[PDB]
Amino acid sequence: GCCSEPRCRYRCR
């Protein structure tokens, strides 16, 4: 996971 966090804005797939 990562999209839920701000660190992965457009990164999280």
Separation between Cα atoms, residue 13 and residue 4, nearest integer Å: 11
> 1 and 11 in contact (C-beta within 8 Å)?
no
Structure determination technique employed: NMR
Query: What region does 5 belong to: left with phi over 0, alpha with psi -120 to 50, or beta?
Result: beta
Q: Within 13 Å, how many C-alpha atoms sit on residue 2's CB side?
A: 7
In single-letter form, the type of residue at position 11 comes to R
Tokens of 1: 């996971």
Report how many helices (DSSP H) and strands (DSSP E) the chain contains, helices first.
Answer: 0, 0
CA 5 to chain centre: 5
Separation between Cα atoms, residue 2 and residue 10, nearest integer Å: 10
